[PDB]
Design a protein around this ligand. Structure first.
Ligand SMILES: CC(C)(C)OC(=O)N[C@@H](Cc1ccccc1)[C@H](O)CN[C@@H](Cc1ccccc1)C(=O)N[C@@H](CCC(=O)O)C(=O)N[C@@H](Cc1ccccc1)C(N)=O
Lengths: 99, 99
């Protein structure tokens, strides 16, 4: 699809059998989900944003469905206020900016 | 034009007589620029992202040129690590997400 930006580019995703809303973020290298019940092993990570920094949980090769389009890749889980879909997944589902 | 997301979607902006590089960010409601010589009156403000919050200086009705495209709007100035073009200005240049 095509999405205009008058509103947040919020979308439905499905991950670890659960349905969640998530923001399509071109300013994010990574995908960061709020605290959630995810299965598998992980590795400790530190990431940065406008406010400062937070510690995440690195989940690799995780399946996720974004607006009907499936992708596998790294998913970070931590103290973020919004679920964020970053370029590691945005490239996957073939998403582009247009103007 | 069309911008894929294999690399950060960085663009050349001109503002206040000066040339900078700014990141096209669909996850940002607002435009936030690093500290810069900007003329005029402004108003304190507090904003948040991953990591926490920063206080910015708010400039209303500032002209800015993005990849050739002229737009006028609010620009925020403060301790952001990088230049961010937000949805307030992204609408003004007809920018959309596509996938
Ligand atoms: C900037 C304002 C107007 C306050 O909006 C946001 O903060 N919007 C955020 C959405 C949000 C919604 C609700 C609540 C809080 C936040 C986006 O995530 C903003 N996108 C960029 C804004 C930005 C870019 C560059 C520098 C500072 C700030 C971002 O933080 N991108 C992060 C997303 C998190 C992530 O990718 O894991 C990023 O790529 N961070 C990199 C790059 C980096 C590294 C170290 C320091 C600074 C940046 C990283 N791997 O840490």
């Amino acid at each position: 699809p095509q999405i205009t930006l008058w509103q947040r580019p919020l979308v439905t995703i499905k991950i670890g059998g659960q349905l969640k809303e998530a923001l399509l973020d071109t300013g994010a290298d990574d995908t960061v989900l709020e605290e959630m019940s995810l299965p598998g092993r992980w590795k400790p990570k530190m990431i940065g944003g406008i406010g400062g920094f937070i510690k995440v949980r690195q989940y690799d090769q995780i399946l996720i469905e974004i607006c009907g389009h499936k992708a596998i890749g790294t998913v970070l889980v931590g103290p973020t206020p919004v679920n964020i879909i970053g370029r590691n997944l945005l490239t996957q589902i073939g998403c582009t900016l247009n103007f």
